[PDB]
Amino acid sequence: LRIKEIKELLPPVALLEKFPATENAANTVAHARKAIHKILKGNDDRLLVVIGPCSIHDPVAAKEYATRLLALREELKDELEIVMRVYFEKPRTTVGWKGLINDPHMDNSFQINDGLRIARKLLLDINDSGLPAAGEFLDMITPQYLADLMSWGAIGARTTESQVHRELASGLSCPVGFKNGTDGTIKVAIDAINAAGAPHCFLSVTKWGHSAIVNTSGNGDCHIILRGGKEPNYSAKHVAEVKEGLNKAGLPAQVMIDFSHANSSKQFKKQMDVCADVCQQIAGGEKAIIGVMVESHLVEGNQSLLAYGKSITDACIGWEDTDALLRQLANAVKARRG
Amino acid sequence: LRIKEIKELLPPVALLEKFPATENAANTVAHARKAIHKILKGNDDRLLVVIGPCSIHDPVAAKEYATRLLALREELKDELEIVMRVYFEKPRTTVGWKGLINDPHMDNSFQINDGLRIARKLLLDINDSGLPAAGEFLDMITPQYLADLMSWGAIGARTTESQVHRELASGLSCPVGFKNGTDGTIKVAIDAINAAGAPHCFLSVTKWGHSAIVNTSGNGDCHIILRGGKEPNYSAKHVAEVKEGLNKAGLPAQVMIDFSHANSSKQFKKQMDVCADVCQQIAGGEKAIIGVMVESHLVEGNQSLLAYGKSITDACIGWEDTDALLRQLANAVKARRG
Amino acid sequence: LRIKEIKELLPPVALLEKFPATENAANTVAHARKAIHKILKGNDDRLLVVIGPCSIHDPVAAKEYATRLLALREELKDELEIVMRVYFEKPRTTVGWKGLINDPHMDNSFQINDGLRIARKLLLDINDSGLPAAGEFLDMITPQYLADLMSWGAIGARTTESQVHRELASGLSCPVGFKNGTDGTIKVAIDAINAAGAPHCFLSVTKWGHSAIVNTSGNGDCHIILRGGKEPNYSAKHVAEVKEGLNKAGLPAQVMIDFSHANSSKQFKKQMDVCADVCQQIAGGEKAIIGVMVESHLVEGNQSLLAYGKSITDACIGWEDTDALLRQLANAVKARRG
Amino acid sequence: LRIKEIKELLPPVALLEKFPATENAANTVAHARKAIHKILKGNDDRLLVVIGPCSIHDPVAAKEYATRLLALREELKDELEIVMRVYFEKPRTTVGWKGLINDPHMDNSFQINDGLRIARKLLLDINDSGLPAAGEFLDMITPQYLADLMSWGAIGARTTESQVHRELASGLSCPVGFKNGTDGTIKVAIDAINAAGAPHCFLSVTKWGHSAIVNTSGNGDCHIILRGGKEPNYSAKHVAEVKEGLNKAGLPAQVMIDFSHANSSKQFKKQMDVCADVCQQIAGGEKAIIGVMVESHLVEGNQSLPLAYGKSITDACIGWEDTDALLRQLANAVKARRG
Ligand SMILES: [Pb+2]
Ligand SMILES: [Pb+2]
Ligand SMILES: [Pb+2]
Ligand SMILES: [Pb+2]
C-alpha cells in the first residue's frame, strides 16, 4: 500500500458558503465570459490578454499586482479584454512545489484546506475589484471550489492530450484554451478542442465532496494556445499552418499566442520580442490572433524555494515591461481595427 | 451550467463488498506483484509479458481468453511472468467508446454502475483462477474499485506527462509502466518515473466515495514502455539510447517494449516482426529488456462498433500467433541465461 | 469533549448490494404490506399476529423459529396474517445491550458493521423463505439498511411521543403501530397516528450514508398497540375507551393488543391469560381488534448477559405455548366470522 | 415509496466555516459550561436561570432580548448564571411549525439551509456579545451545526424516555437537563439521567455530513427539570418526593424547576406565582433547587401565524417587565439562602 495517510478535506460547499461570490464578483465573471465569448465568435475585434504571474504564492503581492493591472484594464478596455492569471496549481516537469492550494506555506506542510481558503478568498477579492481571472485546471477535484470565479481556463501542454482533462473542459462554464504539447505538436490541441466540443459522461466530485456520474454538454468556446515546442511557434508561417490545420479539423482558425515558456525559449524578456512580432502582425491586419498570454509580475526574474514581487516558479517580465507591452498590444489592435 | 446531468455512483465499498477478493484472487495479485518486483530489482531474469486484448468488451470472450492464457502462463512460468491485459478504460484520440466501465452496453447508455460491477466481477474471476491482470489507469476515480485486483498498471502515452497521473502512480500498490509520448519522446516517461518515485500529497476519492487529501510513498517500481512515435523505437539502437538516458536521470536502465501501437506501425501482424527483433536482442544477451507488451485476442484483426472474439478498438494478433510468440519469447529468455 | 471515538460505517448501499432482496423476498414484503393494508382498511377479517422473540441475538435460533412459525403461518393463513418479530434494536430503561446491530457479539465490542451484515442477511433469509418480518424502528439511521425487508414496524412506548419517530413513521413504506406510553397514556399514541398521517419535512440519512432533507407523504396505515401501563389495558372496557378516543380524534377505531410487557404484568405466562380474554372478545364479535402482538421464542423465560433458544432480554412463552395460542386466535377469528 | 423528495443539505463544516466561533463566543460557552458544572457539583450556590422565548422566530427581536437580558445578567451575575433560551427546534403535540431551522420563513417553505445559516449566525452573535445560550436538542442531525455555541441543553418531556435522545445527551459537551414526562412521571427523567451518565455507542452524523459509529463517554452533568404533569410539580411537597427518588436512584438530589408549561397550567401569568413559591423555598433554605426555567419575551402572550414584533408564535410568555421583576425576586431569594 503506497498510501501513507488519508486526511479530511473541506467540501466545495464549505468554501462556497464561507466565501460566496458578491454581486459585483458574479458580474465580473459573467461579462468576461461573454466578452471572451464574442472575441471567439467573431463579433468583437479586441484581443484577449491573459497576463499575470506564473504562479500565485503571495496574496499580498497578488493583490498589489491586481490593483495595478485593473487600472490598465480600464484604460485599455476599448482594445483589450484583460484577464489576470491567478494560477493556483502548477505542473512540474518532475517534482517541485505544485502551487498555493497544494502547499500554501511553501514548506512541505501541504495545508490544502488553508490553501483552498486562501485561494478562494483571493480569487473572490480580485473578481470583486472588477478584474476577471484565469487559471490552469490541472487537478480534477479543485475545480468545484474555484470555477465559478474563473473567466477563462487553460489546459496545460502536459495535459492537453489527456482525456480526463478534455472531459473536464467539456463541462466548464468558462472558455478554455489548450496549450500545444511540450514538443510542439499542434495536432494534440486541435484534437483536444474537438474532443472538448462534444458531450461526455464521466466520474467527478460534486459540490458536496462525493463522486457521481456527470454528463456535460460540450464546450464550444475552446481554442488553441501556441506556446512553443523544440523551437518557437509564434511566427506568421507557423500561425498560418495552425490556421489551415484548424480549418482542416472543422474549427475556427484563431489562436491565442503565448509569449512565454517555449516561445520565449525560457528567456523571459524575449516575451517582448515575441510581443513585437505579434503586435506587428496584429497591426499588419492579422485577424486570427484572438488573444495572447504573458507572464508578468511586479519584479522581473524569479527565485526558488524570499523576495517580494518576484516569481518562485517561472521567470516573468516586471511591471514597467508589462505596462509597455500592454500599450503596444492595444496600439496594434487599434491599427488592426481601422 | 455546462453540466447536463448528475447521476449517483456506487462507492468503492459497495463493489468491494459485493465482490471481495477471494483467497486465491488475493494470492495471485500478491505473487505477481512480488514477481515483477524481483524482475525490476534485477534478482530474477524472466520476462514480464503483459498481453491480452486491446479492450475488454465481452466478459465471455475474456474468460475464454483467460483460461487459454493461463495454460501458457503455467506452461511458461520459468521463463516468463504472464499477466493478462484486462483494459476497462480506453483513451480515444478524440471521441469514441471509452471502455467497458464507461459504457458496458456499447450503445451510448453509459450504465457505469453496471460497468463497474461487470468489470470487478470479471477481474475477480480471472484473478481467482490464478491469472494476474494489468490495466491502464486512465480515470482518477475508478482505481479504488479495481486496484487491489491489478498486478501491474500502465499510464498511457497521452497521460505520462500528466502530473495527475504521475501522482496516482506514486500511490498505486502495483508496479507501473509509463508509455513514452505519442510522437516518440522518451524524456516525458523518464521524468514520469522520477516524478512517481517521490511522495506526493493530492486530492483523491476514498473507498467511501468522498474526496480527501492523500499522501503517497512514491513508487519504486516504475519503468518505461517503448511504444513507438513518429518512428518505431524498439531497435537495439533505440534501446541503448533509452538505457543511457535512464542512466543520466539516475534510473535503472530497463525497458518494457510494446510490440503494438506505433511500434507495429498500427498494423497488428507487425507485432510478430517486432517480436523477432526483440527476441534476437534478448537472446543476444540484452539484460535490459525487462518485459514486453502485446495486443492479442482470440480472433485477429478488429472490427468497428459484431464477431465474438475480435477487438472493437485496436487490431490484435489472434491465438495461433499469440501462442507462437509466447514461445519465441520463452526460448529467447532461455537463450539469454545459459 | 464527550466523544471518545468516530469509526467508519458501511453505507446502506453497501449492505443492499451485498444482500439484495431476492424475488421471493420482495414478494413476501409486498404481499404482507398489502395484507395488513387490507385488514386496516377493513376489507379482510383476519387478525394480524406479530409474534416472535423479544430480541434476535442468535441467527441460528432465529432461523429455527422462523421455520417453525412459517409452517404455522401456512396452516393458519385463512384466519391469521402471521409476521415474525425480527427485532434488531432494543430500547433499554437505562443501560443494557441494545440489540444485535449495535453489539452483535454481546461482549461490548460494538461491531455494528458486522451487526448490520448479520442483520440484513438474516432478514433476507426469513423473507426469502416466504415469512414476513416486523421490527421496532428505534434508531434513525439503521432504517435504510432494513426497511425494504420489513412488512410492519412498531414505534415503542418510550418513543411514540417523540416527533423524530413520528417523522420517521410518516415516510416508512410499511404499516406502523404506535405503542401507548409506559404509564398507560393512550393520548400520545392517538396523537402519534395523526402526526404520522401528515407530510413532514426533516433531515435524514440517504442510502449513500449522507444527510439530506426529506419530505414524506404521511402514512395512513398506522394504528395503536395497547401494551399496558400502570395496570393492564387489554380488557373490553379499555378497548371501548380507546375506540371512542380514536373516534374523537377522527381516526378508524381499531387496536392491536400486545399480550406482553405491561399487559402481561411482565411475567410471560400471563400472555396466555390475556390471549384467553382477547379471544373471548374477538369471538364475541369485537370487529376492532385488528391485530395482536406476542413475545415467543423456542424456549420460555429469559436470561441475563448462555441457553439456546431463550430470550436474553424479555421473558417469552416457548414454542409449545406459541402453537396453542396461535390455534386459539385462529379459532376465535373463525368464531367472530360465523 | 412514502418519500416524495430528497434535497441537499449543507454539511456542519459549511456552517462552521462560514460562521466560526469568535474568541469571545468561545469564551462565553466555556465559562458558562464551567459555571453550571460548579453549580451542579455544589461548589457555587448561585441559581442557573434559563430564560428566554419559547421559540426564536425573529432574529431582530431575539438580538434585542439578548442585549436586555445580557444587561440584567451582568447586574445579577452575583446570584444568577443567566443563560438565554435560544430554541430553534420545537416539539409539536401533533403537527405545527417546528422552529426556525425547519421553516425559517414560517410559510411552509422549509428553507432549512437558510434556517441553519440564520440560526448559527444568531447564536454566534448572542454568544459573542457575552450571553450564553440554551437549546432543546430535538433533532439528531442539527446538533453538529450548533452544539459548540450552546452552554446547556434540554431534552424535552416528549423525548426524555427516548434512548436515541439519552444517547445524544451522553456525548454533548454541555450540561443537559431532562424534562419529566407529559403526564408527570419523574421516573423516566431519573432513568434518563442514569442512562446519559453511561458511555454509549450508536450511529450519528459527523461534521462532514456522513453517518459514522460514535462512542461517547457519558455525561455527568445532567439533572431533572420539573415541568409539571396532570398537576403542577413545583411545590416543596413535590420537590421533597423527587429529591429522595434521585437519591434512591443514586443521583445527586438537585432539580431545576420550570415555571412554565404544566407547572403554570399553560397560562403564562402563573409563572410569577410559581416564582413566588419557588423563591419562598429557596430563601427558606432549599439547597436542592439548582436552577429554574422561565419563558419570556419582550412582549407577553403569543400570537397566531405582519407580526407583533417581540411576541411568541408558539407558547405564551411573560413580557419584559415581569421578566425583570422575576429575575430580581430570584436573585434576592438566592441571597436569603446564604444568610
Ligand atoms: Pb509557467
Ligand atoms: Pb491499444
Ligand atoms: Pb420486549
Ligand atoms: Pb414551550
Residues 6+ positions from A204 with CB-CB distance below 8 Å: A140, A168, A171, A211, A212, A214, B141
What is the tally of structural domains in chain A? Answer: 1
Q: Would the CB atoms of D208 and B210 count as touching at under 8 Å? A: yes
Residue D211: what are its φ and ψ, rounded to 5°?
-70, 150
Q: Say how far apart CA B225 and CA C90 lie, in whole Å.
A: 60
Among partner residues B11, B17, B208, which is closest to C18 by beta-carbon distance?
B17
Q: Residue A330 and residue A80: Cα distance in Å, rounded?
A: 6
Name the residue of chain B whose CA is nearest to C117's CA. Answer: B17
Residue C302's DSSP bridge partners are: C311
Q: DSSP secondary structure string, D57-83?
A: --HHHHHHHHHHHHHHHHHHTTTEEEE
Q: Which amino acid is at A177?
A: G
Q: Which residues contact C40 (CB under 8 A, 6 or more apart)?
A: C175, C221, C223, C252, C254, C290
- Return the C-alpha cell found at B299: 480472433
Radius of gyration of chain B (CA): 19
Residue type, C216: T
CA of residue D302 relative to chain centroid, distance = 19
What is the rounded (10 degree) CA torsion for D275, D219, C103, C92? -20
Q: Could you tell me if D9 and C203 are in contact, meaning their C-beta atoms sit under 8 angstroms apart?
A: yes
Q: How many CA atoms lie within 13 A of D197 on its CB side?
A: 16
DSSP D296: B
Q: Look up cell 508589462; give the residue.
A: A322
β-bridge pairing D201-205 and D211-216: antiparallel
Quote the minimal CA–CA distance from A159 to chain B in Å. 5
Nearest to A73 by CA among A12, A133, A148: A133
Reference B297, options B36, B109, B37, B54; nearest CA is B54
- Cβ partners under 8 Å of residue B305, min gap 6: B97, B106, B312
**DSSP-assigned letters across all residues of A298-335:** SSSBB-----SSSBSSS-BB-HHHHHHHHHHHHHHHHH
Q: Which residues contact A300 (CB under 8 A, 6 or more apart)?
A: A268, A269, A310, A315, A316, A317, A318, A321
Place of cell 373516534: C247
Size of chain A, expressed as the number of residues it contains: 338
Can you say whether residue C24 is alpha, beta or left, with left for phi > 0 and alpha for psi between -120 and 50 degrees?
alpha
Given a contact cutoff of 8 angstroms between Cβ atoms, the answer to whether B151 and B133 are in contact is yes
Check residue B202 and report its DSSP letter: E
Contact D83, D152 (CB under 8 A): yes
Q: Yes or no: say if D81 and D48 are a contact pair by the CB < 8 Å rule.
A: yes
Locate D13 and state its grid cell: 463544516
Pairing of strands D3-8, C211-216: antiparallel
Residue with cell 468489470: B119
> Which ligand minimizes its atom distance to the CA of C261?
3
Using alpha carbons, list the distances in angstroms from residue D217 to A154, B89, C5, D102, D319.
52, 48, 9, 30, 40
State how far residue B336 is from chain A, nearest Cα, in angstroms. 33
| Domain CATH number, residue B221 | 3.20.20.70
The nearest alpha carbon in chain D to B212 belongs to: D208
* Per-residue CA distances from C224 to A70, A105, C138 (Å): 71, 63, 17
Chain-chain contact of B138 with A98 (C-beta, under 8 angstroms)? no
Residue given cell 387490507 in the structure block: C38
Give the domain range for residue B68.
1-338
Question: What type of residue is A297?
Answer: H
User: Which residue matches cell numbers 466555516?
Assistant: D17
Taking CB atoms and an 8 Å cutoff, what residues of chain D touch C185?
182-183
Cell readout for A180 is 500545444
Cβ contacts of B14 on chain C, cutoff 8 Å: 11, 13-14, 17-18
Task: Classify burial at B237, counting beta carbons within 10 Å of its beta carbon; exposed 0-12, middle 13-18, buried 19 or more.
Answer: exposed
Helix (H, G, I), strand (E, B) or coil at A87: coil
Q: Which stretches of B19-111 are DSSP H helices?
A: 23-41, 59-76
Element (H, E) at B120: helix B112-128
Contact assessment for residue C119 and residue C100, using Cβ atoms and an 8 Å cutoff: yes
* C-alpha span between B144 and A210 (Å, rounded): 14
As a whole number of angstroms, the distance between CA B180 and CA B156 comes to 8
Burial of A45 (0-12, 13-18, 19+ CB in 10 A): middle
Cell numbers that stand for B174 in this block = 502495483
Question: From CA D204, how far away is CA C4, in angstroms rounded?
Answer: 13
Q: Rg of the Cα trace of chain D?
A: 19
Q: In terms of residues, how long is chain C?
A: 338
Burial pattern A239-252, b for ≥16 Cβ within 10 A else e, equals: beebbebbeebebb
Q: How many residues does the structure list for chain D? A: 339
CA distances (Å), D124 to each of C85, D25, D132, D173, D296, in order? 47, 6, 10, 17, 21
Separation between Cα atoms, residue A75 and residue A57, nearest integer Å: 27
Q: Give whole-number Cα distances, A311 to A103, A317, B223, D107, in Å.
A: 16, 10, 34, 55
List, in order, residues 6 or more apart from D136 with CB less than 8 Å away.
D87, D89, D90, D91, D153, D154, D155, D156
- Tell me how far apart the alpha carbons of residues B66 and B83 are, in angstroms, rounded to a whole number: 10
Cell digits of residue A58: 503571495
Q: Provide the 10 A C-beta neighbour count for residue A121.
A: 14
Question: Helix C59-76 to helix C319-337 angle, to the nearest 10 degrees?
Answer: 30
Query: Would you say D10 and A17 are in contact if contact means Cβ atoms under 8 Å apart?
Result: yes
* Touching chains, C (3+ CB pairs < 8 A): A, B, D
The data reach a resolution, in angstroms, of 2.6
Q: What is the DSSP letter of B3?
A: E
Tell me, what DSSP letter sits at residue D317? B
Provide the grid cell at C181.
Answer: 406510553
**Residue A323 CA, ligand 1 centroid: distance in Å:** 20
Cell of residue C311, nine digits:
430470550
The pairing of beta strand B211-216 with beta strand B201-205: antiparallel
Query: How many CA atoms lie within 13 Å of A230's alpha carbon, on the beta-carbon side?
Result: 5
HEC string of chain C? Answer: CCEEEEEECCCHHHHHHHCCCCHHHHHHHHHHHHHHHHHHCCCCCCEEEEEECCCCCCHHHHHHHHHHHHHHHHHHCCCEEEEEECCCCCCCCCCCCCCCCCCCCCCCCCCHHHHHHHHHHHHHHHHHCCCCEEEECCCCCCHHHHHHHCCEEEECCCCCCCHHHHHHHHCCCCCEEEECCCCCCCHHHHHHHHHHCCCCEEEEECCCCEEEEEEECCCCCEEEEECCCCCCCCCHHHHHHHHHHHHHCCCCCCEEEECCHHHHCCCCCHHHHHHHHHHHHHHCCCCCEEEEEEEECCCCEECCCCCCCCECCCCEECHHHHHHHHHHHHHHHHHHHC
Question: A251 near A190, Cβ under 8 Å?
Answer: yes
Residue with cell 469564551: D27
Contacts of A208 in chain C (CB under 8 A): 210
Interface test with A, best of D8, D17, D117, D120 (most A CBs within 10 A): D17
Report the residue of chain A nearest D20, measured CA to CA.
Answer: A18
Mark out chain A residues that contact chain C at CB-CB < 8 A.
208, 210
